[PDB]
Symmetry: D7
């Protein structure tokens, strides 16, 4: 019961890092063999870090607008001593180029494993909106 809390804590940390534009921080939580389905891949299965490094260097760098993220009804499956899965709904509140409020939704899955006594994210599937807020 206590193990579900630390998956949600770790997941929160990861999302924080991304919104902060901290590539250094992000690289410590992801497995170096990470794979992902996301809208920016145009239906392709991407693998490794360097496809993502572009957005941390050229988009997230300029992040100045106020933002808020809410995680709704997380379901955690624990499937060994060192293995976990989480499914959740994500709401992001942001302000657009007109100065008006906006909200966008994505539905998301992450898979976790614990090599060397540290949790690492090995896979990610993002659906509905992209990871960055929709336009």
């Amino acid at each position: 019961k206590a193990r579900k809390q630390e998956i949600i804590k770790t997941t929160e940390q990861l999302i924080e890092a991304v919104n902060n534009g901290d590539f250094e921080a992000y690289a410590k939580i992801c497995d170096p063999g990470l794979t992902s389905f996301e809208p920016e891949a145009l239906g392709n299965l991407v693998e490794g870090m360097d496809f993502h490094r572009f957005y941390f260097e050229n988009l997230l760098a300029k992040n100045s607008k106020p933002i808020h993220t809410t995680i709704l009804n997380p379901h955690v499956h624990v499937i060994g001593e060192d293995a976990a899965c989480i499914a959740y709904i994500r709401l992001t509140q942001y302000i657009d180029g007109q100065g008006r409020p906006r909200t966008s939704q994505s539905e998301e899955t992450r898979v976790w494993h614990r090599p060397d006594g540290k949790w690492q994210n090995v896979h990610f599937h993002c659906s509905g909106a992209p990871v960055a807020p929709l336009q």
Copy 2:
């Protein structure tokens, strides 16, 4: 290396069962606590079997058209003695109501665990097209 083959074999079996409209068969491979993201849920996270039982009783029952399914570039992560994850691209070839050929694509993730010495599917995330071919 040999453990990746049996995940792909088991995944194939599951997809076969669905196309066949065999609810009995389908219920043996899924965990009774299965959860899923799929377009038919309208962005909601559904849990348990009875949301799916409707399509096996009222749609799949009438399945008469010829169909072919191809799995492209499956990536398998093995994350314990009894835990596995698979990501893949799915192409379905089918014939429409005009009698013309059609093809549709979905991109898909499944998570697997082995309680009682049998593999069970615990989570599913489907993206692009629905599980049944698009119109």
Copy 3:
């Protein structure tokens, strides 16, 4: 903790009655001073039973199609010995006039009171789709 279960049980019963087209049954669970916000009222606050009696006599009577209803993440507030409130999301699966599957969503609130030792529904607010499935 046990009182939340009987609100969800009673709410289920009410929804059953409506789908069944049982006006007799429906009249026993509702307060005779019931009020409602629903799309069929065109933004107006209707009160009493006879606005609803039309659909039980002229629409629900003919109900023949297969249907399934799922209640997602019900939140119950208990606010006295004899007073309760419930908020929930409703998914309805149905088959259309072409013979194709459909799903529709509504988000809903009900308020309950217990005069004479029996639960009665005193107010209802329906949002998104109407009470009957959308077209």
Copy 4:
């Protein structure tokens, strides 16, 4: 008969606070376990204060335009010594970015309980327009 007046008085106070952009004031009238259905949640059931805190910090702060709000035909149910429900129609008059007059309508439900001898709002369902005037 006298208890219906103090529900309408309290409801008026709450709406005043929101239009004024007074988060401090707003937090005293709402229950800390408040839940709401509103268009900004995109069909989701939100809970707690911090989803709302964003608009008091980033939108309502800048409120400068003249505004008027009218409550039409409030119906109050009183359902214990310490429990009440109110349904009402809301008209808001405002001036747009062109300097022209506008009016918008919402239809609304609030549920009230009296712990510690003070009325607290425990649930809210907003329909038609959002809480802030429509564009």
Copy 5:
């Protein structure tokens, strides 16, 4: 206080007569100098009975479909011993040519006078939908 009830009673009777297609009955309640604003006049002020006699002879005659009419929040002004005014909102529920339910709204004013000890309708203004249900 009692005089407001008999205006609402008389108004109900008139609406009944129209839906029934009873021209004989309708002619007894209206003043022979009746005037009206209604959508069928195309923005013109019509006077006397023979413009209306057409619909009782050629449309209302064929009235076979089920119908229900609800009067919402009637306001009555009494302005002498023998003079009254009523404003109200009207909801009509009907079934269309596809066999589907429909609802339409009109907002309406009637003026009443009592020559020879019998109430007579002297003016009518109809707005939103026409007197017969909208298509």
Copy 6:
């Protein structure tokens, strides 16, 4: 015959006051229990003065453009010693934001009563265009 002239005279005075933006003047001619149907109410029946006070404070204040109003074919019913009704068509000529001429039409009903030996307007129904010229 002479009593029809003073209703038309009084009605003219009222319309003058509105176009002039004289709230003080307007308040003396209307009954404090005035009710109205007008397009700005969005199909609702408004009552009392403060819904109208907004336009005298924020729109009519700025009235600078040339305007002309013509009343066509007024019909007056006199229904006691102290009670009257008037129906009329209104044409307004105005100049738009391009500097081009425009004309708009509304069709209108007013009801009058004479408490304390002074005529007061008790009800108003406006149809076609709003009270202010259309855009």
Copy 7:
């Protein structure tokens, strides 16, 4: 004052003849040098009877549908012992090819002269709809 009545009587007779499809009757009331502006002339000024004779032989012949015509607010100028002018608005109620009611408006001028002690129509200008009801 009495001479205005016989112009309206004569005008009524003419309109009757046209709706009846009586070319014989129509030819007795019109001057043989009649001229007209009407939509069927496509902006041209037609003169004499034979342009009109086509519609009495090929359209009006088949006239079977129920019809009603109302003349609103006729203004008559009398301009000698034997000379008159009339301006009026015409409403026609008719039933369309779907079996639904319709109404159309035209605004019309006729000029009259009395050679040989009988009134004759010398000119006609028709505007808005054509002489026959609009589609």
Copy 8:
């Protein structure tokens, strides 16, 4: 034969006055009981001078652009010693806001009477374009 010339001469004079923006001149040629059908009246029959006085004070005042008017195929009926009617087609050439040439057509009727030994225009019907050139 000679009397047809002076009607065309007088008609020319009137049109000149209007294009010149000479309200003084215009008032001498029209009967004080003039009536008209024109597009600016929105299908209504206007009477007297003050509806027209607006355009001489606020539009025609600014008339600066070059203009030319041509009268085509005038037909004159003479119907007493002191009574006449004229029907004609009018072409107006003008330059638009882009500096490009434009032409517009109207088809027109005027009725004339001679009280006190001076011709006066008693009625006017304008069709196609308005009196001022079309945009």
Copy 9:
């Protein structure tokens, strides 16, 4: 003055022949070196009879519908003992494939010469609609 009448008479005869579908008759009135501008030539200048012979053999042959043709304001120039030109406007009334009346306009020029003591048409220019009625 008398020579203008015989040009209009001859022109009438020609138009009669065409509507009648009489190629024999048509060939006697036209010069064998006839040239024409008409919409059927697609902006080309056609010469001789055989381009026209197609419509007399394959379209005009089937002419069964009622038709009427009116010639408006013919202008004739006579330019020798044996040479003439005519310009005119043509209105055709016809019944369409729905059984509804229609009217179409063309504007037309013909040139005439008298070799061997018989008038012959040497050129034709047709504008607006084609020679046969428009669809």
Copy 10:
């Protein structure tokens, strides 16, 4: 054979004059009783010079752009000692308001007579584009 050359020479001269904006020159070649069909007349037959004088005073005056005109396949009929007709196709090359090249086509007829030993143009019919290049 030689007489066809002088018609084409004279026609060229006329077109030159128009493009040059020389009203003086143009008036010497046209008959004072000239008539024309042209698009600027809106389907009407204009007669005399003053309708054309407008374009020489207000459009052609400003002619500054480069222009070229080509006459294609002129057909000349000679129909007396002093009477001629010409049909031709006209291509005009011009530069538009963007500075891009444009070409437009018209198809044209002119009729010529020789009073007092000088050729004069008595009629003109222009089709496709107007006389000035199309936009």
Copy 11:
């Protein structure tokens, strides 16, 4: 001068053969090394007979509708004892699937050479419509 006639004669013969659907005849007039630009080639340069043989076997075979072809203003260049070129405009009149007349235009070039004392067509360029009439 006489050699231009036999090119036009030979060209006529070829077009006859095509419309007749005579592949045998067509093959005798074309060079076996014929090349062509035509719309059916989709912008490609086709060479030899077998691309054309398809339409003689599967389209032209069924040719039943009446057709007429006119050749306008042929220009012939003769460029040796045995070499010629022709440019021309082609009008085709035909009847469509509704039974209505149609006309289509193409502009065309053919090149001719005389090996073995017989004229042969060596190249063809077709522009505007295809060789068969347009739809």
Copy 12:
């Protein structure tokens, strides 16, 4: 075999001259009796040099943008000692008004003759795009 090379060489030279805006050079290679089909003629067959001289004086003069032209798969027929024909596809690469690259295609035929021992172009047919690059 060697004669095909000098036709392609000469054709290249001509295209060079046009792109260079060298009218002097262009006039030496073309026959003074040149004819052409090109889109700028609007479906007409133009003859002689002066229609083309306009573009060398008013468009090609300003040619400043970079351009490249490629000739694909030229087919040459040689049809005497002094007579030749060439068919080819032309690709032009250019930069537009936004500064973006563009490519356009035309398909083209030229006919050549050798009077006085120098090759001269006698005919040209251009299809798809115009001679200058498309917009």
Copy 13:
């Protein structure tokens, strides 16, 4: 030079087999490790025979319509004793469901290798239209 002929011969044979619906024949010419880019794969790289086997069993089986295929300008590279590449343009002529002719274009590459002394196709890239004719 002779080796280019046998590649074109072999390529022709393959295309024949496909149009014939001969899966047996097709399997002998392709390498069992064949890969392809084609529109039916939806941008994916397919490998092996069984994706293609569907169309030979369910589409090509029913092939009844007349068809013709033309190969334009094949370029062959020979790159060893046993290795070759071919690029070509393909035109297909076919008849549609209306019975009208159609043509479609694809541009295509094939790669060939000679194991065991027999040519085998190892790769295919198809662009523009699909392998079967476009709709």
Copy 14:
């Protein structure tokens, strides 16, 4: 197995050169007889270097924006000692003129041969997007 690595290495080098705008470098890796299918050729098969030289001189020269290219799932066939083929999917990430991120996909084939002991690219087929990123 080792030979597949050097094809992928060489292919990477080529793509690098293109993005860098290094024409010198690009010319060393391509065969001087290179052929290509690419969208810029408009369906044509181009051959040699000078069609490509335009983009290295006029587009790639200005390349300043950040860019990233990813090669997905390369398949290599090796078909001799000196002959190879590669098929791959290409994703390009770039920033647009608004400063927003973009991604585009192409699917691509290259053929390689080793004359003189150096690998040279002999053919290229590009599909989906062009070689430069899509707009």
